[PDB]
RNA sequence: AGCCAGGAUGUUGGCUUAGAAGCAGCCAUCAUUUAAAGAAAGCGUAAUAGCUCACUGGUCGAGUCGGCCUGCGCGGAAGA
């Protein structure tokens, strides 16, 4: 789930998170969920959160997800002594920072959008907070 | 949006920006309308509660500077990445 | 902290005598109570009371807001006291009073046979009704709470010691 | 209607006179037979609608003796002959048949005048317009 | 009974009460929902 | 806040069905009367009734509440 089909390179720097990036402003809808901390995000967590919102809002409104994994990351399949090059990629990963808006909604009531994002936030590794369109 | 007051600023950048944003003032600018850009400081009282309503961006605003009152419109709004805080704001002349 | 403002009100049947911290109150319930205003100060106006804070004691109106309730409970305690609400359920079950010793039969090996605290009387007008008599609102509720605790109410049988209350803790059976 | 409190509703259909789940669970214990009920309104159905058995409200007294709160054509059955609707309209102002004229609404109101208590022809409208609002049918021009 | 680790305010007959340092659930309509800690 | 008193009318709402009286599928989130009253939250249950409610009023009487900002805490919290 959630990775590209062609890649120029797959062996990559793990790197660190700067705590800034693009974000803060809601622009696909009227309500959203913001990261409000540092951590690590996977495709299984995004799908578990997608599967959560579809129980609250069902078929109502449209749902936008501006987030997708940042890098391929290498892993080896069993517990092992390191050496003889990097392993292989079975999943991609992203580092998230406090200003990132993760999910956006519009065609739904505010007290339902907040309740659906509370249900989706239970699938995520960090405390998250509700955000509005802020008229601009 | 009924008339608001502002004051001219001369000290600027990073440390002066953070020392202005001390839970009391904000930086702002007025530009365009065939006149030069003006740098101003704004008290936190009204402007934050005004930008809660969409009419703040679709209807003109009257601002007092050096005791004299002029017409402007809101154009851009810079926000803080990890707290609900206002960093800087733009106004265009009318 | 609003309740220290209250007038409290007293019936004509109390004379309300006071000297420093000591308040002396009596009435037709056979009691002569001497109660203390030690951490707070009270002033009487023949029919109404006012409380306030003392020098070297807790500031504000909070510890005064408690002192009104205890004095009202003793003005009631010396005049007429407090009414019945404790009950028993079960056939052959029996409450009985043997002077300062009480008995409660619940189909078990021994009928409790417990001895009363100081300043309290027990009465049984019928073998399934329990009345506690005195002037202290606390002891007549504490001894009922120590008595209800013997074996405790049974879920489907409903049997044991209960209070007069519209809530039902007796459970109904289910189909298997 | 009048005095409708604690009462069950049932359709006078012979197809519904054998399956017990569509029936209130005490009505048979309360002494009623469902086929005797269907028979007791068959000529009262035939004389106001063809093919559709009426929904009726039932009441019971001593010696299992039952009586009805219904004897007039229902507002929902009159409306299906008055507007281009098949069986209802659901959402307001989505279909071109989803409207009725106030003049025809106050006309069919008098077809139910034997179940009107308001003693006024405007109070007949106030007692049928709610079924149009419930059906998603537009009553404003 | 149970404790689990968190409490919900799921009905109107439930108010949830903190007594002698601990929070608990009581429901006069349904003893099935008694819970300790929160 | 508590204490006290109410919680209508169109209406048996409309449709769909296996199924019914918020409360086993679906639709509007209607209008008049009124100081006030939903096709809704949790119970009741085989159900209904009804409560615990939304929603208003009396009584009393001057502050009161959710969220949010910013300082500081508690319980959550087991091992040889």
UniProtKB/Swiss-Prot annotation, chain A:
One MF term in the entry's GO annotations? rRNA binding
User: Which Gene3D superfamilies does the annotation name?
Assistant: Ribosomal protein L10e/L16
The protein's UniProt keywords, in alphabetical order, are: Hydroxylation, Methylation, Ribonucleoprotein, Ribosomal protein, RNA-binding, rRNA-binding, tRNA-binding
What Pfam families does its record include? Answer: Ribosomal_L16
Q: Which family does it belong to?
A: Belongs to the universal ribosomal protein uL16 family.
Q: Which organism is it from?
A: Escherichia coli (strain K12)
Q: Does the keyword rRNA-binding apply?
A: yes
Q: What is this protein called?
A: Large ribosomal subunit protein uL16
Posttranslational mods: Is hydroxylated on Arg-81 by RoxA. The modification is nearly suppressed when E.coli is grown in anoxia.
Q: Which SUPFAM superfamilies match?
A: Ribosomal protein L16p/L10e (SSF54686)
Q: By its UniProt entry, which PROSITE patterns does this protein fall under?
A: RIBOSOMAL_L16_1, RIBOSOMAL_L16_2
Swiss-Prot record, chain B:
Pfam families xref list: Ribosomal_L25p
Q: What are the boundaries of the signal sequence?
A: none
Identify one Gene Ontology CC term for this UniProt entry: cytosol
Alphabetized GO MF terms: 5S rRNA binding; structural constituent of ribosome
Recite the UniProt keywords alphabetically.
Answer: Ribonucleoprotein, Ribosomal protein, RNA-binding, rRNA-binding
Statement: the UniProt record of this protein carries the keyword Ribosomal protein: yes
Q: Which SUPFAM superfamilies match?
A: Ribosomal protein L25-like (SSF50715)
State if Ribosomal protein is listed as a keyword: yes
What GO biological process terms are annotated to this protein in UniProt?
A: cytoplasmic translation; negative regulation of translation; response to radiation; ribosomal large subunit assembly; translation
Q: Write out the function statement from the record.
A: This is one of the proteins that binds to the 5S RNA in the ribosome where it forms part of the central protuberance. Binds to the 5S rRNA independently of L5 and L18. Not required for binding of the 5S rRNA/L5/L18 subcomplex to 23S rRNA.
- Entry's family note: Belongs to the bacterial ribosomal protein bL25 family.
Complex and partners: Part of the 50S ribosomal subunit; part of the 5S rRNA/L5/L18/L25 subcomplex. Contacts the 5S rRNA.
Q: What is this protein called?
A: Large ribosomal subunit protein bL25
Species annotation:
Escherichia coli (strain K12)
Species classification? Bacteria, Pseudomonadati, Pseudomonadota, Gammaproteobacteria, Enterobacterales
Encoding gene per record: rplY
Swiss-Prot record, chain C:
- Highest taxon listed in the record's lineage: Bacteria
Q: Which UniProt keywords apply?
A: Acetylation, Antibiotic resistance, Ribonucleoprotein, Ribosomal protein, RNA-binding, rRNA-binding
Does the keyword field hold Zinc?
no
Q: SUPFAM superfamilies recorded for this chain?
A: Ribosomal protein L6
Decide whether keyword tRNA processing is in the record: no
GO terms, biological process:
cytoplasmic translation; response to antibiotic; ribosomal large subunit assembly
One annotated GO molecular function is: structural constituent of ribosome
The N6-acetyllysine modification is found at 43
Q: Name one Pfam family in it.
A: Ribosomal_L6
This entry carries the following GO cellular component terms, namely:
cytoplasm; cytosol; cytosolic large ribosomal subunit
Query: What Gene3D superfamilies would the database entry show?
Result: Ribosomal protein L6, alpha-beta domain
The protein's matches in InterPro entries, at most eight in alphabetical order, are given as: Ribosomal_uL6-like (IPR000702), Ribosomal_uL6-like_a/b-dom_sf (IPR036789), Ribosomal_uL6_a/b-dom (IPR020040), Ribosomal_uL6_bac-type (IPR019906), Ribosomal_uL6_CS (IPR002358)
* HAMAP family listed in its UniProt record: Ribosomal_uL6_B (MF_01365_B)
For this protein, the record's PANTHER family field holds:
60S/50S RIBOSOMAL PROTEIN L6/L9, LARGE RIBOSOMAL SUBUNIT PROTEIN UL6M
Q: How does it assemble?
A: Part of the 50S ribosomal subunit.
Record-stated family: Belongs to the universal ribosomal protein uL6 family.
Function noted in UniProt: This protein binds directly to at least 2 domains of the 23S ribosomal RNA, thus is important in its secondary structure. It is located near the subunit interface in the base of the L7/L12 stalk, and near the tRNA binding site of the peptidyltransferase center.
| Protein name (database record) | Large ribosomal subunit protein uL6
Species this protein is from:
Escherichia coli (strain K12)
UniProtKB/Swiss-Prot annotation, chain D:
Record PTM N6-succinyllysine, positions in chain:
71, 80
What GO terms describe the biological role, i.e. biological process, of this protein? cytoplasmic translation; ribosomal large subunit assembly; stringent response; translation; translational termination
- GO (cellular component) term, any one: cytosol
Q: Which PROSITE patterns match?
A: RIBOSOMAL_L11
Read off the InterPro entries from this record: Ribosomal_uL11, Ribosomal_uL11_bac-typ, Ribosomal_uL11_C, Ribosomal_uL11_C_sf, Ribosomal_uL11_CS, Ribosomal_uL11_N, Ribosomal_uL11_N_sf
Q: Which domain of life is it from?
A: Bacteria
> GO molecular function terms here?
large ribosomal subunit rRNA binding; rRNA binding; structural constituent of ribosome
Q: Does the keyword Ribonucleoprotein apply?
A: yes
**N6,N6,N6-trimethyllysine PTM positions:** 3, 39
Give the Pfam families listed for this entry.
Answer: Ribosomal_L11, Ribosomal_L11_N
Fetch the CDD domains from UniProt. Ribosomal_L11 (cd00349)
Identify residues that carry N,N,N-trimethylalanine.
Answer: 1
Q: Which UniProt keywords apply?
A: Methylation, Ribonucleoprotein, Ribosomal protein, RNA-binding, rRNA-binding
Q: What does this protein do?
A: Forms part of the ribosomal stalk which helps the ribosome interact with GTP-bound translation factors.
The record's family statement is: Belongs to the universal ribosomal protein uL11 family.
- Please name the NCBIfam families in this protein's record: L11_bact
- Quaternary assembly: Part of the ribosomal stalk of the 50S ribosomal subunit. Interacts with L10 and the large rRNA to form the base of the stalk. L10 forms an elongated spine to which 2 L12 dimers bind in a sequential fashion forming a pentameric L10(L12)2(L12)2 complex.
> Would you tell me the protein name for this molecule?
Large ribosomal subunit protein uL11
Q: Which organism is it from?
A: Escherichia coli (strain K12)
Gene encoding the protein: rplK
């Amino acid at each position: 789930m959630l990775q590209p089909k062609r890649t120029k390179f797959r062996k990559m720097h793990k790197g660190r998170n700067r705590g800034l990036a693009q974000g803060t402003d809601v622009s696909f809808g009227s309500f959203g969920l913001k990261a409000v901390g540092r951590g690590r995000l996977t495709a299984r967590q995004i799908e578990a959160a997608r599967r959560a919102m579809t129980r609250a809002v069902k078929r109502q409104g449209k749902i936008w997800i501006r987030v997708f994994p940042d890098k391929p990351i290498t892993e080896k399949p069993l517990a092992v002594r390191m050496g003889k090059g990097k392993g292989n990629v079975e999943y991609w990963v992203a580092l998230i920072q406090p200003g990132k808006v993760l999910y956006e909604m519009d065609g739904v009531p505010e007290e339902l959008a907040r309740e659906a994002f509370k249900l989706a936030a239970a699938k995520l590794p960090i405390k998250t907070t509700f955000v509005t369109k802020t008229v601009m | 949006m009924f008339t608001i007051n502002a004051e001219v600023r001369k000290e600027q950048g990073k440390g002066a920006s953070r020392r202005l944003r001390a839970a009391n003032k904000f930086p702002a600018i007025i530009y365009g309308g065939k006149e030069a850009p003006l740098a101003i400081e704004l008290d936190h009282d009204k402007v934050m509660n005004m930008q809660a309503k969409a009419e703040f961006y679709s209807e003109v605003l009257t601002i007092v500077v050096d005791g004299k009152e002029i017409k402007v419109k809101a154009q851009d709004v810079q926000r803080h990445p990890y707290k609900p805080k206002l960093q800087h704001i733009d106004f265009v002349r009318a | 902290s609003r309740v220290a403002k209250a007038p409290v009100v007293v019936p004509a049947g109390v004379d309300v005598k006071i000297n420093g911290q000591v308040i002396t109150i009596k009435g037709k319930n056979g009691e002569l109570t001497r109660t203390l205003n030690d951490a707070v100060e009270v002033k009487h106006a023949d029919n109404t009371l006012t409380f306030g804070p003392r020098d070297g004691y807790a500031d504000g109106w909070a510890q005064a807001g408690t002192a009104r309730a205890l004095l009202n409970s003793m003005v009631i305690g010396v005049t007429e006291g407090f009414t019945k609400k404790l009950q028993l359920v079960g056939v052959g079950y029996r409450a009985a009073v043997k002077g300062n010793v009480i008995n409660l039969s619940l189909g078990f090996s021994h009928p409790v046979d417990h001895q009363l605290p100081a300043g309290i009387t027990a009465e049984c007008p019928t073998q399934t009704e329990i009345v506690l008599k005195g002037a202290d609102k606390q002891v007549i509720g504490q001894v009922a709470a120590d008595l209800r605790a013997y074996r405790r109410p049974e879920p489907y049988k409903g049997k044991g010691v209960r209070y007069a209350d519209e809530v039902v803790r007796t459970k109904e059976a289910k189909k298997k | 209607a009048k005095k409708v409190q604690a009462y069950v509703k049932l359709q006078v259909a012979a197809g519904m006179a054998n399956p017990s789940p569509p029936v209130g669970p005490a009505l048979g214990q309360q002494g009623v037979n469902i086929m005797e009920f269907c028979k007791a309104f068959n000529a009262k159905t035939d004389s106001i609608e063809k093919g559709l058995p009426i929904p009726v409200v039932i009441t019971v007294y001593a010696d299992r003796s039952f009586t009805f709160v219904t004897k007039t054509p229902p507002a929902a059955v009159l409306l299906k002959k008055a507007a281009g609707i098949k069986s209802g309209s659901g959402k307001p102002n989505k279909d071109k048949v989803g409207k009725i004229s106030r003049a025809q609404l106050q006309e069919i109101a008098q077809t139910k005048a034997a179940d009107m208590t308001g003693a006024d022809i405007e109070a007949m409208t106030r007692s049928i317009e709610g079924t149009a609002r419930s059906m998603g049918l537009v009553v404003e021009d | 009974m149970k404790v689990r680790a968190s409490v919900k305010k799921l009905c109107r007959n439930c108010k949830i009460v903190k007594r002698d340092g601990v929070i608990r659930v009581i429901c006069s309509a349904e003893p099935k929902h008694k819970q300790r800690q929160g």
